[PDB]
Amino acid sequence: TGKIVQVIGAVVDVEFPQDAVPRVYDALEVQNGNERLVLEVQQQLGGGIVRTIAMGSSDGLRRGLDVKDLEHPIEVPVGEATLGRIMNVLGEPVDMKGEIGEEERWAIHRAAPSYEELSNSQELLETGIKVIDLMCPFAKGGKVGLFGGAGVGKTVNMMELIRNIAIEHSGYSVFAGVGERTREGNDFYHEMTDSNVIDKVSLVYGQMNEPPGNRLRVALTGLTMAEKFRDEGRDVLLFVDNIYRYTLAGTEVSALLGRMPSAVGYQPTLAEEMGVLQERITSTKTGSITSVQAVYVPADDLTDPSPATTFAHLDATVVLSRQIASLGIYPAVDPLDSTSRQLDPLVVGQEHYDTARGVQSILQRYQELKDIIAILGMDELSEEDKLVVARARKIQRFLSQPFFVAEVFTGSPGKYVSLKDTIRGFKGIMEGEYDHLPEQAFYMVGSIEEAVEKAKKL
Amino acid sequence: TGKIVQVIGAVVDVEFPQDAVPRVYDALEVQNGNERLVLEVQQQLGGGIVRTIAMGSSDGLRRGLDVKDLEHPIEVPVGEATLGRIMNVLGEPVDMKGEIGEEERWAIHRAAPSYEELSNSQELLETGIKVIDLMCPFAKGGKVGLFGGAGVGKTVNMMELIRNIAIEHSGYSVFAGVGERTREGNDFYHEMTDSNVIDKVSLVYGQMNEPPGNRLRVALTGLTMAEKFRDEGRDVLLFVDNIYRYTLAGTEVSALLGRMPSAVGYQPTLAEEMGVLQERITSTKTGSITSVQAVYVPADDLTDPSPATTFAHLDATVVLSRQIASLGIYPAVDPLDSTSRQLDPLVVGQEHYDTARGVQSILQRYQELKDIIAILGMDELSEEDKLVVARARKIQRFLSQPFFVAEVFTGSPGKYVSLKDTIRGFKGIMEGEYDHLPEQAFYMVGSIEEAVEKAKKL
Amino acid sequence: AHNEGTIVSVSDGVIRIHGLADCMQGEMISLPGNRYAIALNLERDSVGAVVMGPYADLAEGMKVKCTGRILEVPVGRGLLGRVVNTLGAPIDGKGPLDHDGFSAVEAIAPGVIERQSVDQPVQTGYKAVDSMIPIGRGQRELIIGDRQTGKTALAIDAIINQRDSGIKCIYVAIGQKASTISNVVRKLEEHGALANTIVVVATASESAALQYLAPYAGCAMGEYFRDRGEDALIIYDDLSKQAVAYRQISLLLRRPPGREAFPGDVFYLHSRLLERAARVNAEYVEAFTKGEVKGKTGSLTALPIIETQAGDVSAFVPTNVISITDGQIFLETNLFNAGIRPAVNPGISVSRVGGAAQTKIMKKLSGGIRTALAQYRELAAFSQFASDLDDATRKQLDHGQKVTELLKQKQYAPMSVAQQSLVLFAAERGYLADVELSKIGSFEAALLAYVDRDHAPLMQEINQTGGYNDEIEGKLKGILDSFKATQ
Amino acid sequence: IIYDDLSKQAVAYRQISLLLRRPPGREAFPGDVFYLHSRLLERAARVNAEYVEAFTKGEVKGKTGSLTALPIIETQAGDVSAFVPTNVISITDGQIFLETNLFNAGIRPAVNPGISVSRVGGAAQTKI
Amino acid sequence: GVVENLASEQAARMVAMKAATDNGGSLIKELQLVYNKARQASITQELTEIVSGAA
Ligand SMILES: Nc1ncnc2c1ncn2[C@@H]1O[C@H](COP(=O)(O)OP(=O)(O)NP(=O)(O)O)[C@@H](O)[C@H]1O
Ligand SMILES: Nc1ncnc2c1ncn2[C@@H]1O[C@H](COP(=O)(O)OP(=O)(O)O)[C@@H](O)[C@H]1O
Ligand SMILES: [Mg+2]
Ligand SMILES: [Mg+2]
């Protein structure tokens, strides 16, 4: 019931009879010959007119085209019918398989859950990767950030978190590929079907080449799915692939929409955008949605607004390191800088907090010793010191481990380790029983029980 | 034929009603307070009006006076008839002899030669300058560029190049000062008239004193002469003072021409305004063009757009830094940030190459040690690195040499070094032959045998 | 609705047209003369278009006809030896276009499930890149660095090493200087690589629309090979010059500028251009007419080239491109000016495909270099204070200096995966540890390389198979022991 | 003639330029700030016998007039590589850097040699 | 001779170290300027591109 008046890039704007005219964030259908592409109302400027963004390519569109005013905002299939395959920003399947089994068809748009939700909540989700559990305990409704530059292993680490929580526990996983690469989207889908994991994992891709308005909403879509699983009363996880590409995509929208830039050219609403995306992710009275999200850092600068506004919302932060990875350790996390707002004794037990700080302590002392070891050699350390260094060297390799999703790379068999095996391992290895076996025993293994085995082959 | 509608600095727009809307690039005159005033059409603004640029002082133009439109783009003479003396941007005889001039005539606006019509050679010419010949050579049919902030000898460098290669020339030269001091031009004319070398040169002068219009067009009127000489006689020299003054002119106007500002307030058309002019200078199948030109760098910022984009258009790019001048080295070339596309082993022989890159390396290795020296003193270097800085500091001041043209304001008589000697000396110092000599032995001398004799006196 | 329109205003290669009510986005628009324009900005009661060519002749009132489809271009096996325009117009010299069919410049990239996981290598020839920043078909490595760090030299050198590997090449020169481009292809001819690579061109003088479209045109030409179960390698030289051209357009069209006055959709521009490059599953047998078997797989590897100013790798355009490409090779101007010629900087560089896009033997023996290099990275600080440290860590420093002195080659001298022998067994034992001093640590390279051409049957063997286990290792061990009975 | 503080002029011109809404450039100065100083200092020069004759209408009939001009630029913290200072240096055919620390230490004609120059040089001086 | 040379070391060291501390202090003064320059350039450009961009 309306006609395109102007069109610039993905910024098509449509006119209507006054009253009735589309609410903001309202959906709009429109044919351009080949297929119908959707529009999302963004600004109800002037009388009768409305500014919108093309969800698909705005090419081919022309003035005077018929734009059908739909009623609701974006529509997306939710519920277990979604688990099982890929689907773009707005519900429709891209995997060439059947059509979405069923939908109550929720809107991608939100409402902050009133602060009536069941914290206290310490359920210490066991991942269970030794280092990401020993150093970074996180609870349901919590959100974990994976920090690092390119190639550190944020995405692959997420793949493991999915597979482990999927098969060793209940699946409950929604993967929002905000502006995700296509190659990654493929290897991910394949790797997920290779293992039994694919259900539950409802994939929601928003390929890089899709318009900004498209990539922006991809987060809310995958969010809305897990947003309903919590309504069903189950503890689901949610992996947003790149918090950076979320804010950045949101930058393009604000840009061509004409808003005045702010910090570093980011949208003048960066705080609120991140605000709503992050705030619905919590543990409600009925259920819970926990999240682990890859936070890319531009130029390895934590002052950049993107990872900056992210920090305020993380309950735990797992920093990965490009240099740690180079040296061969592939759960490439720095134990010294990885943190958790939950890693205190009365939350995670004394044994956990003690051996945690201990690994931290010893890793640190080695760092100090490392200086004198180069300048005046190893022979200078006291017997107790060169014992600390041997014992530290060991725990370093121990907290590395072969991921299951990593077999396509290394070929070795991946291994899941408990929280109690891990603590039982590190505590002993530093007290320290396993002094009689060479480092390599701890290189890539489950609990030390396996390390002692490899030590026999040695 | 038409009348004025607006006047804003150099930009005046004229109403001409439909019948004869001036072609985009086209001339037209106006009677002001006294004399003729050529405007150049720039934009066919909608409504039968047209934007132009005053090729003279826009002061004294009424808001309504009539303007005649001609069909000629720009009237500039070309050929041997021009060799005699100085010209205007309009192709008028600015000197005191009513020009005999044109047997023909060309427009200052031209197209870049066809791709397959472009030639190239590798016959390197030899400048007197030791730095240039060693660090960055060029064959005839080359594009050399002299980058430098204010007061780094920018002009005197070009004039010394001129006196060195305008002799081996035996051909037709075309100097084209643009946005420069008029005092230099007067001296260059008188100096060249006494040496009687004017009859093979050809002047054209758009001063930094003249209005904007003259400057951004005088660069074109300059090479359109060299182009004529090219499309007949084969070997021409083209010297241009400050291509920047041309771009800079286009910036003073870009605002009034009514286009949004690019980065740092530059025109959005910087990419093309440069390329058009810069792409014109080339070796045709019919005849080649050797050309050096003084590209100014604003506020010493080599990242400033003018220099940044200008770089790609140069075969050899020698750059003068204020830091090297602040020392006393007055061919103030930074031998590190200065390079040529033809410092190729297959082109300049292996001995020249290895010597050039050898000199380049040790000079760079020195820049690294420069830091620890300043904080912890010389006595902290290894006996090897100690020798590195010593040998480097010899090179660093053997790069220097007094220019003939520079005798005027400095007691030091000039010198001219063989491309052969330049290799002999530096190769030599690097081998460790001339070590015993003090540093001052190398500062401001010709061949190495001068450094030797100077060491005797002191 | 109306088919025609008239020119209201014309300036800076941009035309604002009245009427032309029937007109699509990005649609072609035939002007008087032969040249067209592009409808990029259809506001109400006026449509701005970018003239794809000179614009001086155009004027007010001129009748401007609407047209059918969008920008298309000549694509096919025939373009190989030729240098072509952005429109596919041969400025080469041969004259006629031996082209097969046409194809849109702007067209969507193959979605998921149509992709095949990348796992086969494309050798750049450089010991440095192929060993620690491996590239593979269907990948996109971002070559990035300051001016004069050796970017292009790396690019066309990677192209030259495909002169024999079966991959077809494309070279999109953008904003470049004509004199330079001819120089390049002239060298593509000195080596047998020119008859195997189409060179698209958009000189510094061509219209903003022509430069801005040059990459996409050269893409559709390369896509041809991938869509038909074949591999190709396109390299967009100066993707920076492209964005500055598109910035010129968006500014003249009065669009809102973001940081550095660049259009907000600049990321989207490069985004869709680069997602175009990828490996596609054999089941792309369904093509223009499914489908002349076609049991093969196809792909399109593309390494773009960003130019940073003063190392500012956080600038607008660089930030975007780095975020997009699944890997990037950082070239440092400091490494370069020093002597380390392939000025690649490990540790900062990355290749998210890694071991997959690498031959079997390389995958094994490159692991030793990656960590040996990484340790030298940690001790680099003590290099100033060397001799202050005990022999334990002192030796690790020497090994590092040598191993980085090993990863450096002359420009036009690609290596034979016998570079394998050199690199691999530089790490295995300090065959460099003897007789280290770095001056000889390279002349040994050119000596081990040619005494293997002495007994190279056991060498072309390792070359073709692209694999190693233990026998071959055993042989390799002896080949070096046997070596130092020479020179 | 000596123009006291061309720095105070350029800043005054920048005021009007920005009030007129003219797009700022480097250091917020209008792009034509070079032309501002350029056409001014270019005025200062030596006119030969013919020009003086033509202007004088044959009254002077054989003499050369001249306008020597030395302007003043006030740098901040010795930053000589600033925008305005660089332009005025690019214009003038010579300069005289009065160093801030040479001045403090009693050397009152604080002229810094090795950096100060007069490109006209030799000709500009008497024989002795 | 050794034991005395050693007492000379401690002195020459603490003296030459005071020099290094003062050299660093001078660099920190020069750097602080180079910084304040960039600090200004940065804030003028960000402000200028926003306002001129809006237009
Ligand atoms: N491996 C190498 N060994 C020796 N010289 C090299 C090597 N690689 C590049 N060069 C030289 O480095 C110089 C510049 O290389 P080039 O590839 O043109 O850099 P570029 O960054 O594309 N510079 P530009 O594009 O003009 O800004 C050339 O003279 C090359 O010959
Ligand atoms: N356990 C592992 N073994 C080998 N390689 C790994 C392992 N884990 C991660 N990687 C490497 O990480 C690289 C990129 O993974 P990715 O997580 O996508 O990087 P990023 O987090 O920066 O996006 C891969 O090429 C892969 O080789
Ligand atoms: Mg990732
Ligand atoms: Mg290049």
PDB file of C-alpha atoms and ligand atoms in Angstrom, chain A residues 148-159 181 183-184 241 245 294 296 320 330-332 401-403 405-407 409-410 444, chain C residues 350-356, ligand 2:
ATOM      1  CA  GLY A 148      42.342 -11.911  21.162  1.00  0.00           C
ATOM      2  CA  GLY A 149      43.574 -10.830  17.755  1.00  0.00           C
ATOM      3  CA  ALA A 150      43.249 -12.842  14.555  1.00  0.00           C
ATOM      4  CA  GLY A 151      44.297 -16.497  14.605  1.00  0.00           C
ATOM      5  CA  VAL A 152      44.330 -16.934  18.386  1.00  0.00           C
ATOM      6  CA  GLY A 153      41.509 -19.480  18.303  1.00  0.00           C
ATOM      7  CA  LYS A 154      38.393 -17.653  19.493  1.00  0.00           C
ATOM      8  CA  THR A 155      36.060 -19.347  17.001  1.00  0.00           C
ATOM      9  CA  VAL A 156      37.533 -22.853  17.226  1.00  0.00           C
ATOM     10  CA  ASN A 157      37.453 -22.543  21.022  1.00  0.00           C
ATOM     11  CA  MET A 158      33.744 -21.777  20.712  1.00  0.00           C
ATOM     12  CA  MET A 159      33.270 -24.857  18.534  1.00  0.00           C
ATOM     13  CA  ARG A 181      32.764 -15.462   7.088  1.00  0.00           C
ATOM     14  CA  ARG A 183      34.294 -20.349   4.776  1.00  0.00           C
ATOM     15  CA  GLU A 184      33.949 -20.431   8.558  1.00  0.00           C
ATOM     16  CA  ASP A 241      30.572 -15.092  16.770  1.00  0.00           C
ATOM     17  CA  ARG A 245      31.146  -7.095  13.774  1.00  0.00           C
ATOM     18  CA  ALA A 294      34.184 -13.689  20.758  1.00  0.00           C
ATOM     19  CA  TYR A 296      37.855  -9.144  18.644  1.00  0.00           C
ATOM     20  CA  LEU A 320      43.849 -15.795  24.217  1.00  0.00           C
ATOM     21  CA  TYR A 330      46.745 -24.407  21.599  1.00  0.00           C
ATOM     22  CA  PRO A 331      44.163 -23.878  24.249  1.00  0.00           C
ATOM     23  CA  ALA A 332      46.069 -20.622  23.768  1.00  0.00           C
ATOM     24  CA  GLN A 401      44.873 -29.978  25.639  1.00  0.00           C
ATOM     25  CA  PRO A 402      43.675 -31.456  22.324  1.00  0.00           C
ATOM     26  CA  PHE A 403      40.225 -30.106  21.477  1.00  0.00           C
ATOM     27  CA  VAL A 405      36.982 -30.026  17.050  1.00  0.00           C
ATOM     28  CA  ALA A 406      40.745 -29.806  16.529  1.00  0.00           C
ATOM     29  CA  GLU A 407      41.254 -33.310  15.101  1.00  0.00           C
ATOM     30  CA  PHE A 409      44.145 -30.210  12.328  1.00  0.00           C
ATOM     31  CA  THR A 410      46.322 -32.370  14.593  1.00  0.00           C
ATOM     32  CA  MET A 444      48.564 -32.810  25.456  1.00  0.00           C
TER      33      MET A 444
ATOM     34  CA  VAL C 350      48.321 -14.786  10.263  1.00  0.00           C
ATOM     35  CA  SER C 351      46.654 -17.435   8.093  1.00  0.00           C
ATOM     36  CA  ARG C 352      43.467 -18.888   9.579  1.00  0.00           C
ATOM     37  CA  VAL C 353      43.673 -21.774   7.109  1.00  0.00           C
ATOM     38  CA  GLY C 354      47.260 -22.549   8.089  1.00  0.00           C
ATOM     39  CA  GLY C 355      48.365 -26.169   7.935  1.00  0.00           C
ATOM     40  CA  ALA C 356      45.479 -27.131   5.666  1.00  0.00           C
TER      41      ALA C 356
HETATM   42  N1  LIG F   2      43.789 -27.252  18.802  1.00  0.00           N
HETATM   43  C1  LIG F   2      44.311 -26.587  17.564  1.00  0.00           C
HETATM   44  N2  LIG F   2      45.233 -27.209  16.797  1.00  0.00           N
HETATM   45  C2  LIG F   2      45.712 -26.632  15.689  1.00  0.00           C
HETATM   46  N3  LIG F   2      45.296 -25.409  15.294  1.00  0.00           N
HETATM   47  C3  LIG F   2      44.373 -24.738  16.024  1.00  0.00           C
HETATM   48  C4  LIG F   2      43.856 -25.322  17.185  1.00  0.00           C
HETATM   49  N4  LIG F   2      42.973 -24.449  17.701  1.00  0.00           N
HETATM   50  C5  LIG F   2      42.924 -23.360  16.903  1.00  0.00           C
HETATM   51  N5  LIG F   2      43.774 -23.527  15.877  1.00  0.00           N
HETATM   52  C6  LIG F   2      44.021 -22.600  14.794  1.00  0.00           C
HETATM   53  O1  LIG F   2      43.325 -21.395  14.906  1.00  0.00           O
HETATM   54  C7  LIG F   2      43.210 -20.892  13.539  1.00  0.00           C
HETATM   55  C8  LIG F   2      42.078 -20.015  13.415  1.00  0.00           C
HETATM   56  O2  LIG F   2      40.997 -20.248  14.266  1.00  0.00           O
HETATM   57  P1  LIG F   2      40.053 -19.078  14.675  1.00  0.00           P
HETATM   58  O3  LIG F   2      39.507 -19.399  16.001  1.00  0.00           O
HETATM   59  O4  LIG F   2      38.968 -18.930  13.703  1.00  0.00           O
HETATM   60  O5  LIG F   2      40.856 -17.782  14.795  1.00  0.00           O
HETATM   61  P2  LIG F   2      40.156 -16.495  15.335  1.00  0.00           P
HETATM   62  O6  LIG F   2      39.658 -16.793  16.690  1.00  0.00           O
HETATM   63  O7  LIG F   2      41.074 -15.315  15.349  1.00  0.00           O
HETATM   64  O8  LIG F   2      38.917 -16.224  14.433  1.00  0.00           O
HETATM   65  C9  LIG F   2      43.020 -22.095  12.719  1.00  0.00           C
HETATM   66  O9  LIG F   2      43.694 -21.990  11.532  1.00  0.00           O
HETATM   67  C10 LIG F   2      43.560 -23.205  13.516  1.00  0.00           C
HETATM   68  O10 LIG F   2      44.608 -23.788  12.882  1.00  0.00           O
END
